[PDB]
Design an enzyme around this catalytic site. Structure first.
Site: not given
Ligand SMILES: Cc1cc2nc3c(=O)[nH]c(=O)nc-3n(C[C@H](O)[C@H](O)[C@H](O)COP(=O)(O)OP(=O)(O)OC[C@H]3O[C@@H](n4cnc5c(N)ncnc54)[C@H](O)[C@@H]3O)c2cc1C
Ligand SMILES: O=c1ccn([C@@H]2O[C@H](COP(=O)(O)OP(=O)(O)O[C@H]3O[C@H](CO)[C@H](O)[C@H](O)[C@H]3O)[C@@H](O)[C@H]2O)c(=O)[nH]1
Ligand SMILES: Cc1cc2nc3c(=O)[nH]c(=O)nc-3n(C[C@H](O)[C@H](O)[C@H](O)COP(=O)(O)OP(=O)(O)OC[C@H]3O[C@@H](n4cnc5c(N)ncnc54)[C@H](O)[C@@H]3O)c2cc1C
Ligand SMILES: O=c1ccn([C@@H]2O[C@H](COP(=O)(O)OP(=O)(O)O[C@H]3O[C@H](CO)[C@H](O)[C@H](O)[C@H]3O)[C@@H](O)[C@H]2O)c(=O)[nH]1
Lengths: 392, 392
Positions: A177, A181, A258, A289, A312, A363, A365
């Site tokens: 991911r 570079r 997780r 982080r 976090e 996984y 985004d």
């Molecule tokens: C810490 C973190 C950082 C992230 N950073 C990025 C980023 O920087 N850039 C990026 O592109 N993506 C990022 N993501 C990923 C992104 O959050 C997901 O791609 C996004 O939530 C997509 O929506 P999804 O609906 O597939 O899942 P979710 O948005 O989690 O949607 C699921 C929904 O279903 C609902 N639900 C579940 N079960 C039920 C039920 N039984 N009844 C009613 N409702 C229910 C939940 O309440 C939830 O609201 C990150 C994710 C995390 C966890």
């Molecule tokens: O310093 C790091 C960073 C990442 N990883 C490995 O690479 C994997 C992916 O890294 P990500 O940064 O993509 O982890 P996250 O999915 O948690 O990332 C989230 O946290 C970031 C915050 O900068 C970005 O928003 C990112 O796109 C968002 O998905 C991690 O599981 C980790 O195993 C490392 O080992 N060391």
């Protein structure tokens, strides 16, 4: 003899709303969206911190980015984007490093400047054990991409805290991911388009569900109301985006996930770390982080006497925990295959589709979820609702 | 009994063309632009290197940036801009450093991570000798902004090679061109709008002079043809943008300038340094910096087997040299004041205006020159040509 709704959507995340919006707007159909949480937007939901006014991404930092022009054009229908480019710094042994893999990182960690050619040569030596084509798991892929010294310093510790799973048991896709570079370009993403929603995530999500043909019920678990709603609209398909294993009462077993805990703190200083996200790669610290949300929006001017930070923490998702990351070990994938077959059965028997991060145990985004949603709309849902075609 | 032209403009740089374009387009007047060089655009002139196709800024790297919205809107009439953000790295004792002043630089140079608060404290101690409000010259201002250890490591050497003048004799304004930050933001500029011309500088400059009422004569020195042209258009004012001292045959004396020599080299490697501009702050190397022009335009895809680099050398401008930088010592400023009075006399007696980097002996960036040109147009030229108002 009319059905109340034309479609049910479980979950108001990006996948759900994209499905709901497309169906409502392009097909002129009525969609009931059901959200278990008190708010829409899933994990993308954001909220302004009272004291500072700074927008906080409640479920971890969300940075939008894609190389998909179709998706880029689509999401801009609901929001503007700032010119923010995401950069991450890594904390290791009391020093902050440029990140990810690049000349900045290499020159810092190895104590002298390396030309692009010299850096390629150095990493090639240190990546000798395993070649990227041959790499099966996270550890092997990471070592083959950034060499073992960098792997041990910046990947092994972080991965331990984030997954608590043997790096040889984690997918290679996890570490790939991160851009690899041999320049000083420390952009954390390598996609064509990138930005933060100018008016925040919640506004963006509210715009998507704004259509009058879309009804979102908050604080409503689908398994509490499906017995009543579906009879009211028998022909209506169901798009489910919650946890796949949970949909079948964990019948075959429990998929490894997780989950994340956050500590949100308002500090009496203007600037805590000088940057939006600081990774903590050493084990002598419990968090993975720290987010400082003021640096997400430099174009907004916030008070300089206070700042909001967020540590976090990562752990295994328990029975009632909200799952964030699919672990996807070999055993998990085996379990996934069984649920997938059941999913295909639910599609056949009850017109139940499965999408999204949780729905497909992937996984995903934000942009991949939206693209996945548009795919499901174009190829499965729209042909069905509009032209009668079955869902398999 | 008609004048051939309504306006003469000496020099086809950004100042000249901005004046020419505004007068031609907004006032419907005919402008003769005279350029001593074989090409327009002044020092902003760019040219594609044959082997690679990579655009080369022939007179040193030109990076456009401004916080002036009016200017930003104006220049976009003639060109699109890429999303390039300029970053500079500094080479010191075999290590590449993040630059300019910020947490990246501080953490690298002092060997451990400094919080924004800790960094402010450290620099405050090292900047104790002199306070910014009290600083008169470059050395004092630099020490008061980044502390003496950083000044000696990253400013003193570079300034020696770029100016070959006592830092106590150089203006403070020189060093305050560089942002001073306590974050990890290493953007070399701090303006609201920034970018490179999508189709290159020359296209942009050609668009400005494209108007049919604008005639540009290349390879024409104004002092060779003014005896003939001005009688043909007696009422027409003259906007002069060449060297101010040279306009008066160096009567009062010679203003101190710096000039630049470049070594352009095509290397048989894809990437020389991994970044657009690398400063060389140590004296053990004759050049001030190295440009690698492929990194200017990442959105263009160039061959990866060759790359174009350009080493930059600084020296005093001799009699026939083209002047690049005004030194502006106390003596220089004294000399400037005399020429300014003469300039004011030439305006009174011959309707000759003086503008631009060379015309006003000022350290002018592209946007400041254009803004200066628009100012001269709005407040001096337009009232004259359109409403008869005198030029003083
Ligand atoms: C810490 C973190 C950082 C992230 N950073 C990025 C980023 O920087 N850039 C990026 O592109 N993506 C990022 N993501 C990923 C992104 O959050 C997901 O791609 C996004 O939530 C997509 O929506 P999804 O609906 O597939 O899942 P979710 O948005 O989690 O949607 C699921 C929904 O279903 C609902 N639900 C579940 N079960 C039920 C039920 N039984 N009844 C009613 N409702 C229910 C939940 O309440 C939830 O609201 C990150 C994710 C995390 C966890
Ligand atoms: O310093 C790091 C960073 C990442 N990883 C490995 O690479 C994997 C992916 O890294 P990500 O940064 O993509 O982890 P996250 O999915 O948690 O990332 C989230 O946290 C970031 C915050 O900068 C970005 O928003 C990112 O796109 C968002 O998905 C991690 O599981 C980790 O195993 C490392 O080992 N060391
Ligand atoms: C190495 C370098 C890097 C720079 N980088 C940047 C940057 O990154 N961003 C930025 O905003 N600015 C940058 N600048 C500054 C910028 O180049 C000037 O602001 C710009 O050239 C403005 O135009 P000007 O017309 O005031 O001067 P010039 O463009 O030098 O225009 C003067 C013209 O007058 C002509 N001329 C002179 N005498 C005569 C004569 N007797 N007869 C006919 N013609 C004559 C010359 O041929 C010349 O073409 C840089 C400058 C240098 C030297
Ligand atoms: O590493 C440095 C850089 C600058 N300076 C001092 O600061 C002054 C100004 O620095 P500039 O970088 O602005 O020097 P230039 O005018 O030559 O800069 C040109 O070169 C840069 C290349 O990145 C930018 O394009 C910049 O805007 C452009 O004006 C210099 O005279 C110098 O005295 C240093 O001491 N050390």
């Amino acid at each position: 003899m009319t059905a109340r709704f034309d479609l049910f959507v479980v979950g108001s995340g990006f996948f759900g709303l994209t499905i709901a919006e497309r169906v409502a707007t392009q097909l002129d159909k009525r969609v009931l969206v059901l959200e278990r949480r008190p708010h829409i937007g899933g994990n993308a939901y954001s909220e302004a911190e009272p004291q500072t006014g700074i927008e906080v991404h409640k479920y971890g930092a969300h940075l939008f980015h894609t190389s998909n022009k179709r998706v880029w054009d689509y999401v801009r229908q609901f929001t503007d984007f700032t010119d923010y480019r995401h950069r991450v710094f890594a904390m290791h042994n009391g020093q902050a490093y440029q990140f990810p893999m690049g000349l900045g990182l290499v020159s810092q960690f190895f104590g002298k400047y390396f030309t692009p050619e010299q850096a390629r040569q150095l990493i090639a030596e240190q990546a000798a054990e395993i070649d990227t084509a041959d790499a099966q798991n996270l550890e092997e892929k990471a070592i083959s991409l950034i060499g073992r010294p960098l792997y041990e310093a910046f990947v092994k510790g972080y991965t331990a805290k984030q997954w608590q799973t043997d790096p040889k048991e984690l997918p290679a896709a996890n570490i790939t991911r991160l851009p690899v570079r041999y320049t000083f370009d420390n952009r954390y993403f390598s996609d064509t388009y990138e930005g933060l929603p100018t008016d925040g995530y919640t506004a963006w999500l509210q715009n998507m569900a704004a259509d009058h043909r879309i009804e979102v019920r908050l604080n409503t678990d689908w398994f509490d109301v499906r017995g009543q709603l579906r009879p009211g609209s028998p022909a209506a398909p169901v798009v489910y985006t919650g946890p796949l294993d949970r949909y079948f009462d964990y019948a075959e077993g429990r998929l490894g996930w997780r989950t994340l805990d956050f500590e949100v703190e308002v500090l009496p200083i203007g600037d805590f770390q000088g940057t939006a996200v600081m990774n903590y790669n050493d084990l002598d610290v419990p968090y993975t982080r720290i987010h400082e949300f003021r640096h997400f929006h430099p174009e907004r001017d916030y008070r300089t006497d206070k700042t909001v930070i967020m540590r976090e923490y990562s752990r295994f998702a328990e029975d009632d925990d909200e799952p964030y990351y699919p672990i996807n070990t070999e055993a998990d994938r085996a379990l996934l295959a069984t649920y997938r077959a059941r999913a295909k059965s639910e599609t056949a028997s009850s017109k139940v589709l499965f999408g999204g991060r949780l729905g497909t145990y992937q996984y995903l985004d934000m942009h991949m979820a939206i693209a996945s949603a548009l795919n499901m709309y174009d190829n499965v849902l729209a042909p069905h609702l509009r032209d009668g075609v079955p869902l398999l």
